[model samples]
Every structure is written in C-alpha cells, then in structure tokens.
Target: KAFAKFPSSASISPNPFTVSIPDEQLDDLKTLVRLSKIAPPTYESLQADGRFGITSEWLTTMREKWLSEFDWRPFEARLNSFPQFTTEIEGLTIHFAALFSEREDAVPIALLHGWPGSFVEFYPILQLFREEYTPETLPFHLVVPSLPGYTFSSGPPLDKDFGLMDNARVVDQLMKDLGFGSGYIIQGGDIGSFVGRLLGVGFDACKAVHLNLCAMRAPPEGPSIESLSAAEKEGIARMEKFMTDGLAYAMEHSTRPSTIGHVLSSSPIALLAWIGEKYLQWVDKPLPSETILEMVSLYWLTESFPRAIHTYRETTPMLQKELYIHKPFGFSFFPKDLCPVPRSWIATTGNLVFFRDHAEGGHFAALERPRELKTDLTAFVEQVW
Candidate 1:
C-alpha cells in the first residue's frame, strides 16, 4: 500500500493531520488483503496442549462454522472510514485515529488498547459519540493510537525500553506532540490499563483516568477480604474468580510471547482463533466476525503482529509493581473482562474516585457495550470536569 518515507528520527507535529496516498499504493493496500491467509487453529490442537485455555473441539467448531461463515470487507470499510495518520515517536511511526467532535468544547480523551487490540476496538463506538453528542454537551474528543509495534504504529524503538515506563514515555511524547499540553483524560483496558495508570502517576497532562480492565495487585501483606467493606468484599470475590478463569492470556504473554507469536504470525487462522476466543468469550454479545477480523487484518497488513505480542513482553512488572499517580480516576468494571481488578485494590494506586460496575460487556467494552461505556465515560468526565 501507500508508504510514507521511513525516517530514522521522525516525529508527528501538533495539528489536525491528514495524509493523501497515491493510487498505486491503493492497489498495494488491496493486494495486502489477497495476501492474507488466516486459519483458525484446530480446537483439538489447543485442547491437546491446554496451554491456550482453549479446547480442540471449541476451536474446530468456531473455525469450521463461524469463521467459515464470516466476512471481513464490511469491517474493513468501517476501518477505512477513519482519517488514519502516522507520526514518528521514539524512533517508530505511530498510527492513530483522530475524530474531533463538531462541538468545540469537547474534552480530549486518549483511548489505549492492550494486547491483540488495535484502534479497531473503538471503531464501533465512533458514530455514537459523533452523532449523539453536541459541542456543548460532548464530553470528549477521542484519540485512539495503535501502540508501537502493534498494527499501524511502529513497534518499540528499543527492545530494552519495552517496559511500561517506556511505553508511557512514548504516549506522553505523543500527547505533547499532538498539542495536548494542558493534559488529557485517558482510558485503557488490558495492557493499556497499565499505560493509563502510568499517565495518572507520571504525566501532569493526564487529568483523569478510566479503565474497563484495572489490573491492580495489592502489596504482599495488604488487606484481606475479611477486612474489606461489603462492596469491597464483592469486588474481592469477583477478582478471585477472574484470576482463576481469566489469566490464560496474561500467563502466555508474560511467559512466552515469542513462541505464541511465531505460531500466530505464520497462520492467519491461528491468529483468528487466538484472538477470536477472547472476543467470543469476553464480549456480552457475539460480535460480528468481520468486526474482529478488521483488527486482525490491520495487524497482519502492517507486519506488526510480532510487535503486538512483544508489548506484554515489554511491560508487565510495571503493572504489578507499585506506583503512585494522584489524579481523579474511574473504572468501568465489566463482569466479563478477561482481567478484573477490585476497586479496593485499585485504590492502592491512585484516587479511585469514580467507579462503575457495568451490568454487561467484557474486555472490548466499546465494541460490545458502547452505550453503557459512553454513558459511564461521559458521566465520569462531567463529574470530574
């Protein structure tokens, strides 16, 4: 597809950004699709190993039935609808989606997606905000950036800096580069949650933070469940359940990202099954297959699939290690999230000011439960601002 001249030390400048691709690149872009070859992994294969938390039977059925019946074009068109741009940050090109609400007073909010997630996670919710909120009423101007080494953005410039601290610096520099000097609100899920957490602690520009997945780890000798409030007790119970049922991906990422990446990167189907299982099991509703593949396709086309895997390799301890970020914060705790941290535990990090336990939805909150996510998000911004 269209290629911007790669620069060794490029940086995105502050402004409304737009780029025009050549017609020749359009052909390359389409050709990239033809080159795509995805095969959902065999459920039997997964079950044989049981390392992926998936059974072989489940993998077979989803692939033979659902995946075979799925289409990717409509979702691709939806992704193409956005004004995608790229900038140099920390020796890598960053790809992001920029949508400004017509409302001039809209507050800027940066949305970060975690592992196996691209900007596509927020695609389903774009219009809900654009058409639903007016300038005076609009609470946010959304900026969704693909993390370096993930999909459209350039991967980490230095393997050594792959830690969350490094990722935070990349995002902070991005915000500064984008002209958000006063600071901006941030929301994240999965790995993005760690990024958001760092912003709350490390950046003055981070006015408020929110998360669908807040993975908080208490100190070794912190409060026990018996010591918590009734609500906190419930949160503890829920978090325990998540740790038991929801940590396969985390375990995989933390331990063997490279091995998983090699298999996933080789076969499109493997990638689909690996990611699809999460979307299927995690979301409240069975989102359309195309919706999921749009994300997979972006990763494939950009050749950043490995980078997506490497992110976790680069930043997990920063998540568990204690850090302080004194800022107003809120969390949308989805019952089905792959990783759910309790509010009482979250309070150990920052001002756990706004909290909402969503009745439905999962990891892909914006896609599976947009109205609820938007409502909670808007309410939090209003309360804070």
Candidate 2:
C-alpha cells in the first residue's frame, strides 16, 4: 500500500504537489554564495561563540557546505515521501504536508510553524508517525502547513496587510475544506502558537489547542517564585536574558518589516546570517549546518523572507482578551525557548488542561525533540479530546 498517499475518503480534493526547486535557481544560489564576499575577521566576527551574532567563520563554513555537501534532492524526496497538497483558502494558495489516517476515528491535528522555520520543523515528527504506524494503524491525521507567505504557500495579499487572525482564518478554512469540519486540534510554537490561540478563541471547529511557547510579561500569581523547581527558575532566567539581549530581531521585524525584508532578501549569505543565528542560539544542540541551510535555502528560493514576516506585527501583540484560548489548551515548556514562561503565567491565557516541561530542547521543540514533543502532544490530545 502507498500508505503515504492521501486517502480516498477525504471530503474534498486538493491538487497533489511536489517540491521541485528549479535547477537554474540552485545554480544561481550556488554562484551567489560562491561569489559573495566574506568580510575580514574582526574581534567580534572571531568570537566563534556567537555573542556578536553568527560569526564570519560560521558563515564561511556553512557557505562551503551549502555549495558542496548539501543536496536539495534528498530533502525534496523526503518531503515528497509524504502526501502534499495545494489548495486555495481565502484567496491564498495554501501548501501542506499531511498524513491522512485511514482510521475512521483518527483525530485531526494541525502542526504549524513560525518564522525562521517552514514546514521542515515537523519532518521528524512526521517521520516518527510513518515509522510507527501504517495508514490503518495511525491514530491521528497530522496536517503540517507552511503558514501563508512562508514557503510553497503563497504570500499575503499585496493590496492589503495580513495579520495573525488572517492566518488563523486561512488555517481554519484549510482544515474545514479537508473534511475536518466536525472539529480539529491546533499545536504550534512562536507565531504558530499565537495563530493557535486565535483559532481556539474564534473558531467553533478548533476543538482544542497546544503550544510550545506562550510569551508573557507578568510575574506568576498562582505560585510564589520561591516555591518553583530549579528548572522552572532557570527557564525564567532564560526568558529574562532573551528579553534583555535576544529581542532586537523581533523589534526590527515588527517596527520596520519592509527594511529588514529587503535587507535579508538581498543575498543568500545575508539571509543565512539573519536566519541561521536562531538555529544556532535557540536549540539545545545546534542543528547540522546542512539542516539550517535547507530551511534558509527554501526562504531564498521562494523570496519568503520578505513575505513571511508580517506576522511579527500582531495587531495587539501577545496579551489580548481577543487572543485568549477559551477551549481546552495545553503547553509544553522548552526551557531554552525565547520565553519559557511558567505555567501560572500561561494559565491566565487559556483554559490550560495539560502542562509538561522537558529536561532539554528549545524554541524548535518539534525539530529538536520530536519524540518528547510528540509524547506531550499525544498525552494532551488524549486528555482533552
């Protein structure tokens, strides 16, 4: 059986799509990376510790790898190994990779990604499901969508701006169109987490939500700071450091999207320096250079760095009555995330039904700790569904 193919019983039909980056584009990227000038090493560039952002050494090493060892074909084939489809939702072409369970009662869940990430974030979790279950045995139908303007998915409408609600609306329509109209769950981190909250709050069909990050600015009221575990205390410290030193990129993305967009879009190396640093800094262990290149390469190929960042300008930022999740909500705490708030802080944002904190991992929890993230997701689904 071609277990990865879309099942025959889905309510609607969407075009089957494959990711085939053009050869000419790859050649251009290789040439640009080859011809790109590397600045002479300075005290800051030689830090190697990345305190001054991605060092020249790191960029040069990654450039060599991207030009030589990193092959796009394998990544293309791996993505095509699963069923992918393109369908229009709300005047935008949406692209998603999915494993549609043949089981009649399989719960429908959507895993969404944030900026500096594409659908690639869920590849490990998707692979896990494939290895563990046949189509008949799989218990959940997982939909991993590239949020509009991110990758294969088209960008926001140029005539007007798109915000988080627009993202939640598009995803809501996507799931309903896929025959999950009865009810479905949303699990996300960073920008996707905010989208999940909007879906949980605004849509009747979004039955529950799970998140890996829920950023906040308040001290906890439920438990005194002194009573928390050492891990929780460390997490709070990480969030503090992030707010103080690690937040410049977000400020730029929010305050001057057009300028940063053009700046990042100018060169392949520029894109890498801007985006690759997050993979280096935010994970428990840095990802392989090739993995980071694959993600940034997609952004460059699609010109997505410019189009994908409009979500940074959330209309009301994170703390809003309109954005709260009234439905069942759950969160997985990755201590190394940009803001790993305590459960008491996040509890005020939703009807939290499940909470778990892992020993390691970071902002890219699904990518960095796929098994652990899946365990939390499975447990939350079982608890709330």
Candidate 3:
C-alpha cells in the first residue's frame, strides 16, 4: 500500500515526497567551500592522525572532494527509493520513510536517529530489507523518520520549549497517524535512545524497545563494579574517556546551542568539521567520505543545524530523573560506543530480556555495521515478539 493510503486524521494528510535541493543552494555550498579559510597547519597535521580533531590537511582534502566529486542528486534518489511521505503533526510537517511488508503479521517498528545523524543512517538497513527480506518472510513494517528540527523535518516551535518528550510524542503520533495506532516497537541510539526510553515508559502504544546505546543516569545505589569482566572493565574505561574528553561538544550543545549554531550554520566547512569529527572518532571503522558529507549536506541545505541541537537543551534535565522502565527491553553494546554500560548496570534499568556484546562497531552502528545490526534486531524481535 502507498504511504498516502495510510489513514490519518491529521489536518494535512501525509503526501508522497522527494528531496531536491535547489540549484542555488548547491552553488552557494560550493562557493562557501571555495572561500573556506583554514587554521595554520600544525604539527598535528604532520601526524595525519585525528587525535587533535579534524586535521587542517584532512579538511582541505574532504572540502575539495565535496566540492568536486560529491554528488547529492544520487543520494537524494536513494532516499526517495523508499516510500517517503510528509505529514503535519502538532503543526510541524514531519518527514519519514516507510517500507511496508506484505505479510499480515508483520510487526510495525520505528527506527529513530540521534544528533549529527539523520534518517540516512537507516538506509543500509532499508537496503537489507529490500534485498534479503520479502513480505512473506519479513517480520517488520519499518518507519524511519527525521526527528523534528532535523533534516527535511520541520523545526520545532522556536518560541517555546521542545525536548525529547516532545520528540517522542510527535513520533508516537506520527505512527498512530500512519495506521499503527494499535502498538509498535522502537529502536534507537544517542538522542534517539532518550526518546525511545520515553516512549517505552510513557506510551501505551509502545510495546517493546531496542537500543544500541543506553544513556541512562547512574542508579541510586550504584552498579556492582567488583563483578566486572575483563571486557566490561574495558567498557568502563571507554566510558570514562568519553566523559572526560568527548563531552565538551555535548556540553556546548546543551548550554549554548545558539552560539555554536551560528558558527555551524554560517559555513559548510564549519558544519562538516563539527559534525564529521564525530563520524570519524566515534566509529570503530572509518566512515566513507561520501557518507559523512551526505549527512553534513542535509543539515546544510535544510538549515537544520541549529535547531537539531534543541534535544541537548531540552532533554539534559531528564537525565537526573530516576527513570525505571517496566517494558521488555533489548540492548546491543558496541565496545567503541560512547557509553557501553555493563550488562549488570543495564539490567537495573529495566526488564532486559535481550543483550548482545559486539566486539567491533561504535556509536553509529547502523551505518558502521548495518548487516550485523540487522541480525541483532532480528534476534531481538524473535525473542520479544
């Protein structure tokens, strides 16, 4: 069935959509690339390692590639390959891609993306569904939406407060509007993780949840650190390193999104460096230059750079709340992820019926290990469904 065929009481019904950045916008992006000024080449440039953030030399290389060889049209076409639609929910025209299964029993699942990431992260998984899974055997009705204030989705109310709960509510409404009002499962990581938690805890329609990262606050009584395995010990060290070294960007986003938003929105290079650095450092394997640029370009053309960080400002306080989920939960722990909570600690968060430890992969597991992630999701669904 077509996305438009889905029943919705939304004042503005969901309509088929496509992505086509105006030619002027593309030209402006190129012009900004040509005029980019870089910092003086430092000794860090000599090493070519990313220890000191994105190196000037590396930026120059990527900038040149983005201007000359990077193609947005093809990427846009790839996005439109799925059944894409936009609908007004809470006065915002939200964008999402859906792949419906022909099977009558196919479960409905919503996949959410986090900061510096967009709907594009799930393209690989969509491909997996298309190529390997058919309606007769497929177990899911998948929906991947660009969160409000990100990419093609309309921004949130600028004059008022909008946070993770708001995002979760918008998504839950979107699912119901799309005819999944009965119930659905949610899978997410990063900021998406928070929204997923909210849905799993607060929404009656959310049946089960899966997560690649668990960004929960410390338990009131604390974890059993003495029982840690060798691997779990390493995971703790990794989390500590992130807390110390990698939290500055998040802090800035939470405290001064507008100030940094101006800097990021002003220049394509600035946007790329600020966002691309995470794709480079947070992944166990290097992301393709084209993939990194594709995400950066989406934020650039949509001018969603500043508003996308609103989750940082709105959801930071939720971290302090003592949130205990009663729903069945599944978790995948990638060793290189920002926070790979020990299984014992994760058990305390909710009824964790499923848990898997990945030897490789990182924060962006959907993009870095799509096939493995797909298998993991399948396993979780089989167990929980």
Candidate 4:
C-alpha cells in the first residue's frame, strides 16, 4: 500500500540570493529577549545545587562581559553574508543555504550541523574553499541546512516524534527537491552523524557517508572488549568518559529542554553562559572571545534557544534502531567529541573505509580548524566520488 503523502508547503530559491533583514525583524529579536523567561542562577545561588560546572569567578566574568559588552549585529551581518532560504517539509519551513561550485560539474555534498549550532559554523570553511581551492582542484556544491527547529527553520507545531531517520528522509527529499538525485556525498557530526549513517543505509542516491563521531558499537554480547586491539581499548576508555562527563547536555535536553530553555532565553548572559561553555569545553583549547561570541550571537539574534533545545525531545527508539548504513564511510575523529567510538565498534553498523585522527581541533572542527577538516573532507570525496 502506498503511504499517504503529507501536504507540501515547502519552498526554495537558488543562490546567489539576496536576503534583506527588515528593521522589524531586529525589533522582533528584542521582543523575544524581553519575553523569554529563562535565567541562569548565579554561582552563589547555584552552589548548593552543584549542577552548573563553573566557578564564581567565571560566572562573574560572563555576567559582566556577555550581558554588557557583547553585541549581536556584527555577527548578524555574518549570517546575512550567506544566501539563505526557507522551505516547508513535514509541516515546517526548513532553512538552508546552498553555495554552488564555480565548476560546471561540482560534486554535491551536504554538510549537516548538530544541535546548539547553526550553518554559521561553516562560514570560515566555506570562505577558505572559495578562496583557496579552484573548482577543478576541489570542486564542491555545498548545501547546509539548519536542522529542523534550529535558528532560521520552523519547529514542528507541537512535540512529535522524529529522529535521525526522519531527518535523513527530509535531507533526501531536500536533495531530490533541489534536483540532484543520482548520487551525492554526506558529512556530519554529533546528531548529524547518525543522520549521515541513515543516508548510507536508506538512500542508493547517497554515494558515501562521512562523519566526525561514529563510535557506535554492537550490543555488548556481540563483541567481547577483551578480544579488542590496544587502539580499540583506548577508544573504549575515551568513550566511557564521553558518556559520563561529556553528555550532561544530552540528559538536560532529552528530559526537560523547556525547563532549561526558560533559563537560557531570559537573559543574554544566561544564554551565553549555556552556549559558550560548550565551545569552551568542546573546542580543543580556548578560542578568542570574538570567535565564541559569533556563535552565541547567532543563537541570540535568531531567538533559536527554545526550538534548538526541543529537537532532543523529538527522538524515537524505533527510528534509532531502524537505520543501519552499509556504504563506503569515512570519519574524521577529533579527540574532544564526547563519544569517540572505535572503528572496530563502528564496523558493527557500517563499513569503516577511512578514518583519520587529528592532532588539533575539537567537536567544532570545521569552524575551529577548517583548513585541516576541509582538506580531510575533500580528500575523502576525491577518493569516493
């Protein structure tokens, strides 16, 4: 039996598209800040709780600098630099940007960003490619989407169950919707890692899957840890720490995103603290304040705090288990990614054809170390495509 199709309300326009932000849009951003009810408890107030992991000194600095000195327009201009667009799919208006290659036959590559992040993360990398590499040398037609409910995209009207598989379907539709259906490559990290994996499994049009976090293992009984190699043993230890310390946000998002959303949305300081800490913690080393604030400002100006948090609430168990990729796969492993599943473990779900361990960078590799990350990505595509 044919599945009934959901009504289509999505739209898209080709680039180089011009986007003009009306003054009213800026006013709406202020309204969002004023109406948001989220607030961060000071260390003094939160000391008894022990949930927040920052010292009083750090909190003091954040409150003063983020609340008083930080500005959002410069970063807003950076977002405006891209030719962004919105289209509806599955009852929501999805936002995405496509930067086509100058070469006549640029290979189609979809770059997916995970939660707490927007397409802004790739600005530097995209510029690097545009400036440094010729289409003939490293030709790419890049499409990046703000995953459902992130910043520019619309959220599901109410909480509904969707997971990486649904996201993959939307991406698949996005590719078909954009008119490149024969074959394409995919790259992702964090939640997007799972989405890329699903693409490998479900879409013949998906020529290859590349990820930064592919530490999925078979069920415990499926492989004895004792039989693993030394490299695998080290990876397992790292994976253990990731689950223990690195995944606190996962618990918060999965169980009570709305509760936390209120606190983050209330004050720019509170929002900065919540988002900045991730960059501080996840990036290999401390980054400049300007770089970090660029990310924070994107979230703030867009009023994306609540919707971004809600994405975690949309996961489903069946969706998690349903997709298993079986294609040429590549992974660029960064040490700071909370879960660094060993290649041995990844083999349980899909073939691990290429894996590279970088000495620098963290979870936001494309932003933190674009040259290295893009080089690795282009090399991978050259081999596979």
Candidate 5:
C-alpha cells in the first residue's frame, strides 16, 4: 500500500518527506556502541599515518563520542530543513533532496555522491546556498540523490542486470520526471563521476558535465611522462600510493560484498571502522568526529550498508572501456584525491571546457571544500550554461 499512495510514473509528483527514525532504533544503536569490543592494535596501526586501517585508539574515542556526545535528532532536523522527496521510476523508489530556484531560467544541476557517501555529502554546499543566495538569485535547482542503494533510495538490483549505466538512466529519468526535459548539467565525484560520464554520453537531457574525480583509466599508452608538471607528478605519486595501498577495500567490496555486508550489518563498530578509514585517509583534513558519526548513523539506521556497494561490483568492466564524453565538460582537481588525472589526460577523456586546480581538499570536495567547490560550479555554469 506504500506504493499505492505515491503517484505513478505517468503522472509523477514527488511527495514531501521527512526523516523520522524510531526511538527504539536509536536506543539499540547506543547499546551496541556501548557494548562493542575492539581489537588491540599492532605497531603499524599506532603510526599516525593509518597504514594498518583505523586505529583502535581512534575508534575507541569515536565510539565514546558516538555513544555520549553525538545527537542524531539535530542532524535529522538538518536533513529535513531542505525539501526532500521520493518518486518511483522503473519499478524502484528513488529518494532525492531538491532546492529549487524561483528564477525561470535557473539551470537544473544534479550533484551525485559515491561510496561511503550519501546525500549528506552535499549538506555543506546546501548550507552555502541557503546562506549566500536567494531563490530569485540562485543559479541552479540543486538535486542531491542517495545513489540507488545508498541511504533512503531503494537499491541493490532485484536482478544482476543493473550497473552504472542503469543508475544513470534512473537519475536521468528522475530529472525528466521533474520537468527538466529540455536539458540540465551534472556534477559528481566517485561513483557519481562515473554515472555522470555515462549520462553525458547517453542522455540527450544532459547538456554538460563536471567532476571532482576522473573515475576513468588513462589511455593504454598513457600520457607522455616528459610533459608532466611538478603538480602532475605529485598527483601521479598520490595515485600510485592509492593503487598500491588503498585499493584493497574496493576489491573487497567488489569481490566479497555479501561477506563484508554481513559483517558491516552485524556490528556498528565494524561499520564505523570500515567507513571511518576513508574519511581519515582520503581527505586533506580530518572531518570532525560528529560529522563522521552522523554519516555512519545514517547508514546504520537506513540499513544501506549492505546494498550501497553494488556499484563497485557493477563498475569493473565499465571502467575499462575508455568511454569518453563529447558534451561540454569541466573538472576541479584536488591534490589529495584518490585518483587525480592530469589535465592533458582529462582533456582526452572528454570535451574539457573548464579546469581548476584547487590548493586544498580531496575526494570529498563538496564537504571538504564547499566554498571552493561552489565557486567552481558557479563559474562552470556561467561559462557553459
């Protein structure tokens, strides 16, 4: 009957929604956190660099904060501050947060987030928009979605046929259903970057694309080594470190999702350690403990941990095909990102119309560098739209 109450695709309308987790669920989570046990760290883990994953000491401190100091109600209220909704498309319910502009000519842009990320990733940008711009002056209708199996969005394919292209189709259809049938721009990082690329390639409604992560492999022969700049070389070295040391988590997600999913689902501490490592290692600065716990709490409450990673499994072959976007494209390269593509390589990947090199920030640009990211997005839209 839940589906019956919602509008059909033929006459699609996004119903207003709010996040209201049961009180008992919150109690159960705290109980688990208070009672959870952690392993004693080896010598490598004690190192500040986090070579051996999230340190037991850090986990202990985080768990203590999560149990005693963190508050979910305020975070839920913050999520509700923005207009949120859900609509069915292709036999699935898609959840998204939309901040609409009153201006008739306002461009519609979808901001997408990837693994270990949810719609929460865009809160900083949303706050910036709320604080600095008005409906009349705002340049965009920002649509932030919980990518297929992440957070409130229904996901993890009913069949094995779903992948990045399928996710792109759902997002494109969501935009068309919302009446942006003519065209819109897209911005994404991580799995979102891959999906945005697919949208630029396959959807007529997608006019231009912007990205923080390349999410694509370089050409077989690769870029000319002699032509590389100092910063480019640094990016290469950073990427090499990730490939060698940081790739195991992805491999586990891709090859053994069900096994890890069960482990993640069974324990709150396991979930924290799994997700917390990325937040610590991938960003230029450490996110506050409260911020990290808020993200972890969302996943735990939504039960999205198991299903959120299906994209990693689906994107293996998709990443290898050398797909290129012909539409207008833009990129903002952050020094500490997981995979930082050279400007020359980025041009070869798409019709790169705008490029900016940020002095700080990393994979989670929307959160880590919201002001810079917003300025870059605004500039790109001014030029392309």
Candidate 6:
C-alpha cells in the first residue's frame, strides 16, 4: 500500500510491479563471470586513460570484484521497497519508479535516464524525497522512466527501427496515461537530456525541462574564447578533446549496432569492458567499484545493452533552430561530462531560465551528485511551475 494517498484519474492506471530476478538467472551470472576468459595484457591495452580502449589491467579488477563481492539481493530488496509500476502506452510497456504526491498543487515531473543508466540512476534523489516528505506534504510527483529498449521496459518493435522521436512520443503518452496530460516538466541526463529536450520541443503537454547534458555539434559563434570564465574555458577544452578523441564508440554504436551488440553481449566480461570505462572516465571522482558492477549486472541480467544502444543511431545532440526548446528550460553543468554545454552556446538554443556550474560530478549526475541535482531541480520547479 505504498503511496496509498495518491490517486490516479487517468483512463489508464498502472499495475503494482515488484522487482525480483529469478534465482536461476543470478546463479548463471555468477558462473559466467567466473568462467569468462578475458584476453591477456598487451602494450596497447594497458594505457592509463584507455587511449587504445578498455585496458585489460582495469577489467581484471572488475572481474574479481564482480565474482567475489558483488551481490544483487540488496539492490533487488531496495527496488521492491519503493513504488514501482508497469503501464502500457503506444502498445509498448513502460516501467518507472515513482513518488506520487497527494498535494493538489504538486507539480508532475518526469525524470528520464540515458544509455547505460536506467530508472535506478535516480534512486538517491528519490530516497532523499522519501526521507523528507510524506505523501501529504511532498510538492512534486516525480516519475523516473526507463526508455524503450532499456532495462525493465519493452524493446522497440522487432520489425521496425526506433529513433528519438518515437521514444519521445511514447514518453509523452505515458505522461498522459498517468494523468499529467495537462502539463509536466522533465529532468534528465545523458540520453535522458536528449529525450527530454524533444518532449519540450514537440509536445505541448511537456511544460518545461531541466537537464545535466546539452552537448551540441559546435559551440555557437557568440561566445569568444577569451571572454569566458576559467571554468567555461576548461569545459570547452574538455569538450574539444572529446570531439577529437572520444566519439569513435558513439560512431560504432550508431553505424554498426548489430555487430557491437553481438560483441558486447557475447560474455559478461565483454559488456564490462565496453561500459566500465565510461563509468570510470566520465566522472570527476571514481564511483565505488561495487556500484559500478551493480550497474553492469543490471544490464547483463536484463539484456539491456543490446537494446539500449539503438538511440546512438540517431546521433548525438545537434543544434537545430527547429529543435530549440521554446518553453522555459534549465541546465546544470558538471565539467567532467564529455561535453559540458557552454552558457553562451546553450543560451542560443532555448528559453534557458536556469544554469549552474559544478566543480565535480559528470555524465551520471543524478547518481554522482543527487543532492546537487535535487537542489537544482527544486529551484527550477519554483520558476517554471
């Protein structure tokens, strides 16, 4: 009877969904990690920054921890302890972890996750609210949704390809199905930021957006290199490095989705190598080794990596006048992110009402800096809602 006080008036109400992995599935994973044969070390595979790709030296550590210390039971227990739901929209199943507010004035919010992160990415932020507010006093109805082809949610139709617009369309319908048809705001990072932007651009029902990523093809011409803050200059340098050295994987994902999927899903070790580096490289500080494995475990167990990478084909963020968001939007910059959107560049894209720069955090902002993300979100809601 969690969230018993919040009522749904939409024509479609979701069923209570509990999270539980079959014992057999867990057993198989333990054996696979143990049995998987990783390649022996080579000169190119030992670089500190993984200049030649995921180092064998790095993976040896992950494989050992995954087998000896990683446990799925606690994470599963935590998921079941929250409000989880499954609802049908656009003939696809949508899974989300939600905090439904009983307050009549509560704002409806959809927090979207990107590739490699799922609805679980927002857990810390959700936990903060759970500890701080009761249903009667909570000021927002927060919904963290798994994108199609991601964990716990249905994949795109097998017969046809899915792209950004299709996923955005499904999310808009989910909001309406949940009784937020009048209006709602979005808060997302990575792919979540991209999908949320589309919702604002294309859907009248999505009232505003708040994001942790806003990578564009090129910096708009207005911001001079000399006039920027030191923080902004450092961010610009990091982004330039990414453009030159970091986009190969994205290109591979977009151009040859099938081959990479076959390669990654070939073994547990393979998936870790491909995904582990992003978790390591993109953050300002290291995530606990256990937390890193648990994320990989979710993808491995749910078979999400193969399906989840489909959005890469749409390509990364592109600056488009037609795609510029007209509604009030906000952005939070974590410098360690692959491409931290410069204030002047993003100012050209939309009616940006909020902006904040952080000395720490990265692509996984909600997971890495939940406290800051939540604070930013509350401030953004105050302005827009």
The best candidate in terms of lDDT: 2
Error of 2 at 9 (Å): 7.1
Estimate the overall C-alpha local distance difference test score of candidate 4: 0.69
Worst 10 residues of 3 by lDDT: 2-11
* Candidate 5 residue lDDT tens string, 164-235: 888999999988887787888999999999899999988999999999988545555557756898978778
Write one digit per residue (lDDT tens) for candidate 4, span 64-97.
Answer: 5544565566666666675566667788777787
Q: Residue 152 in candidate 4 has what lDDT?
A: 76
- For model 2, residues 1-385, the per-residue Cα lDDT tens digits are 2445554445667688888988999999999989888888899999967798988888888989988898888978887887888988777889998888888899999999998898989989989998999888999999999899989999799999889999999999888888888899999998998888889998999999999988876643445667677877777888889888888898888889999999988789999998998989998887888889888888999899889889887722434365668899999987788888788878878888899978788889989999999989999999999
lDDT of 3 by residue, 1-385 (tens): 3322343323336588888788898888999988988778888755667777888877888999998899889988887777888888888989998787766677889999998899989999988887876656666888999999988899789789898899999999988886777888999999899899999989988988998888654555767666788888878878888888888888899999889999998889999989988988999988889988888988899998898999887555332244566788999988889988787888888789999988899999899999888888989988887
Model 2 ranges off by over 4 Å = 1-11, 219-230, 315-321
lDDT of 1: 0.67
Q: Considering TM-score, which of the candidate structures 3 and 6 is the better prediction for this target?
A: 6
Is 1 or 3 the stronger prediction by lDDT?
3
After superposition of all CA atoms, the RMSD between model 4 and the true structure is 6.3
The prediction achieving the highest TM-score against the true structure is 6
TM-score of each: 0.79, 0.95, 0.94, 0.82, 0.94, 0.96
Model 6, range 263-293, lDDT digits (tens) per residue?
9998998899888878888877889988889
Error of 1 at 382 (Å): 1.7
**TM-score of model number 3:** 0.94
Pull out the clashing pairs in model 3. Answer: none
> Going through the candidates in order, what is the number of backbone clashes in each?
12, 0, 0, 6, 0, 0
Judging by lDDT, tell me the better candidate of 3 and 6. 6
Candidate 3, superposed: residue stretches over 4 Å from native: 1-12, 44-47, 135-137, 314-322
Clashing pairs in 5: none
**Position 165, candidate 3: lDDT:** 90
